[PDB]
């Protein structure tokens with residue numbers, strides 16, 4: 001089948017927005033395509049991290065990905081650092097990428113007006129990300145609007161390498177998410193929902209307990225009209241809430257409007273709070289079952305193992321072309 | 327015992343000056359100290375390389391080191407790329423080093439007034455070099471006046487890592503060769519002898535054949551005072567020769583001076599030429615023996631093994647501290 005590579009920054013918290021926009025759809029994709037889900041812990045180290053928190057967030061993320069419904073026998077789930085080829089191929093590519101290319105990256109602006117105290121990791125992480133991708137001959141890389149820049153560079157490195165040393169890598173394509181909706185902040189309906197929002201009331205986490213989901217939805221910003229009708233502009237807040245309600249319950253927007261006809265936001269919010277709790281419940285159940293189970297490790301184990309099989313043969317061929325070793 | 331780490335760039339052409347200044351001393355030292363001789367092929371790739379050449383020079387140099395007298399049961403001799411812990415540890419170190427430190431690196435001058443098209447690996451090989459040294463707890467690194475700068479950085483990185491994560495690394499020390507024998511070039515006695523000299527007659531290669539040694543020596547530059555007397559200033563050429571002669575035949579400089587009291591440069595050169603030929607003879611043989619012998623790879627294999635055995639361990643500990651993997 002076609003291959004798909006997806007790197008996951010270990011951070012132990014993914015929003016209902018991530019779930020709805022991309023994650024959820026993967027459970028389907030994993031039968032049509034050959035998926036790889038790498039918990040890129042080496043990339044997470046480019047910025048300060050607490051060792052214990054990071055070690056923890058790596059298990060959390062794997063627990064949660066399985067909990068959501070990723071099948072470890074169908075797809076491949078693994079931790080980046082337990083597959084050495086990543087770092088090995090990262091070095092080889094660093095050697096074919098020019099400094100300029102990495103400097104002119106619309107993300108290295110992190111150098112902040114004379115910071116200087118920036119890890120070289122920040123500057124060099126793109127060639128590692130190219131490795132993550134290229135090592136498995138991936139075809140599609142499900143990234144957002146923002147990442148596109150990195151995809152292009154890996155595409156460039158792939159070809160540069162191919163022409164200099166021979167046809168080895170597959171040029172990857174940056175495919176966008178399905179969504180067709182987008183989940184906005186509950187506190188500012190114009191802004192997009194994210195884990196990195198300074199206000200916790202802005203998002204709902206797949207591990208938020210009922211009491212907290214109840215609390216956050218009540219607070220979600222609506223408007224003064226008092227009617228449950230879809231209106232992108234004019235009624236941003238309601239329209240968002242309706243969007244969340246609809247994708248999770250399977251009921252149309254037209255349907256939900258008709259249902260909440262002469263009802264106000266008070267009950268609407270109380271209803272939504274429920275549909276969310278009813279939807280996260282099994283996930284939070286399964287998740288804890290995975291955090292307790294030693295079967296988790298056995299999964300990561302065969303994950304790496306399956307990944308290593310391919311990565312290695314790729315590096316072998318890379319070292320072969322470059323002229324390294326024997 | 328104490329550990330000594332030495333990275334060797336693959337070039338297959340080491341001069342009689344390198345030999346006299348460092349190599350020779352190791353055939354002895356390898357019995358007291360724990361020595362690692364790493365053929366840094368990953369570093370050699372930061373600049374344009376031809377696959378065949380690099381692949382070749384790696385053998386040639388392994389052969390050479392054994393020929394000169396490195397006892398593989400006593401010391402460890404391995405190729406860099408064959409021990410993954412090097413790249414792995416290189417990445418983690420790139421993450422605790424700031425971009426400034428790498429730019430203010432007095433060697434990055436190869437940036438050519440803004441040539442811009444330089445391999446990022448060029449800007450980043452210092453962290454790899456720190457890896458190489460640090461992975462083996464090495465106490466001493468025999469580098470010349472030229473590399474000092476890099477040893478300073480690795481001393482720094484090592485110190486930084488230890489403070490953040492705890493005592494793990496030995497802060498190495500750069501210990502130079504035994505002073506007195508600084509072998510200048512055969513054509514310019516104020517210039518140092520190097521494989522990188524554009525005039526072939528400025529140096530003698532451990533594999534230079536008799537006819538070539540004879541011709542280069544004869545053309546060695548001398549003064550007109552026509553006496554075989556040591557004179558650092560005034561008589562540079564003769565003092566160089568007297569140094570090459572002395573260090574090889576074991577005679578004292580004065581001994582040679584007296585022994586030549588009423589002789590000219592014609593005979594002195596004819597004598598020197600043969601004592602050089604006599605010294606390389608067994609090396610050139612042992613070198614060809616090793617080259618075609620399949621035992622070479624076996625030696626390299628047990629080198630990887632021994633190296634990896636320690637490297638893997640140190641990486642495991644580094645990953646532990648940084649918070650990577652499981």
Ligand SMILES: N[C@@H](Cc1c[nH]c2ccccc12)C(=O)O
Nearest residue numbers: 005006007009040043129132141
């Ligand atoms: N920084 C990217 C990095 C990344 C690493 N490996 C990947 C694989 C696929 C897509 C992105 C990546 C992100 O968080 O998305």
Ligand SMILES: N[C@@H](Cc1c[nH]c2ccccc12)C(=O)O
Nearest residue numbers: 331332333335366369455458467
């Ligand atoms: N550039 C140094 C690099 C080096 C790599 N690995 C090393 C290990 C020890 C000392 C120096 C190094 C040289 O050619 O000498």
